Amino acid sequence: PQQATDD
Amino acid sequence: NTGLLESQLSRHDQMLSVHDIRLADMDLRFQVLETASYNGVLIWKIRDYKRRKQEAVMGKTLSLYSQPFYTGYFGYKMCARVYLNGDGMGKGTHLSLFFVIMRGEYDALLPWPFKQKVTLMLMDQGSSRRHLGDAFKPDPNSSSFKKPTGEMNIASGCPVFVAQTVLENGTYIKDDTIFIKVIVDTSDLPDP
Numbered sequence: 208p209q210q211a212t213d214d
Numbered sequence: 215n216t217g218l219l220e221s222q223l224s225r226h227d228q229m230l231s232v233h234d235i236r237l238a239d240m241d242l243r244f245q246v247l248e249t250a251s252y253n254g255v256l257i258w259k260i261r262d263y264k265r266r267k268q269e270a271v272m273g274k275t276l277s278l279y280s281q282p283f284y285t286g287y288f289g290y291k292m293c294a295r296v297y298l299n300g301d302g303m304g305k306g307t308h309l310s311l312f313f314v315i316m317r318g319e320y321d322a323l324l325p326w327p328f329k330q331k332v333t334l335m336l337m338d339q340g341s342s343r344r345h346l347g348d349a350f351k352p353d354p355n356s357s358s359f360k361k362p363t364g365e366m367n368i369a370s371g372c373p374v375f376v377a378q379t380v381l382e383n384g385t386y387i388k389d390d391t392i393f394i395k396v397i398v399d400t401s402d403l404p405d406p
């Protein structure tokens with residue numbers, strides 16, 4: 208589980 | 215006076231304007247509902263792949279969201295986010311697909327953090343049905359699976375889901391449209 212860039 | 219007639223016209227025009235948005239909004243609202251799901255499974259249809267892909271590149275629209283879907287009538291409210299041109303380590307090279315937890319109206323009664331297994335995938339429209347997907351188990355310490363505070367939590371998924379080439383070369387696209395499917399495990403959780 209990786210997160211998306213802040214935007 | 216005539217300033218009265220004109221004032222009244224103005225009042226009307228102003229309200230007619232509002233009404234138009236109110237109406238538009240509802241069309242959108244209808245759509246969302248008509249596509250809702252309460253078994254923890256989402257089938258997201260994305261039309262205009264070319265244009266949308268191009269707008270991702272041009273930086274006009276980096277990502278897209280699915281309509282919300284639920285694990286149950288009054289369960290978690292979730293959705294998906296996709297970057298047609300990739301995000302993070304897959305940016306420009308892949309298509310990034312993420313899972314999102316939205317602030318549900320019944321979170322006060324739901325277990326936190328979110329612990330249901332999630333299975334992300336892109337469907338193959340070719341007759342060989344060689345769908346692409348991958349699943350994961352929410353990380354308890356991740357700020358993506360905690361009780362929502364704002365409208366949505368931090369999207370969590372796979373930045374390098376599929377190589378843009380693989381996607382555009384295979385039978386995943388057909389009639390300028392692709393299908394994304396999410397499967398959240400519900401069975402393993404005390405239901406209402």
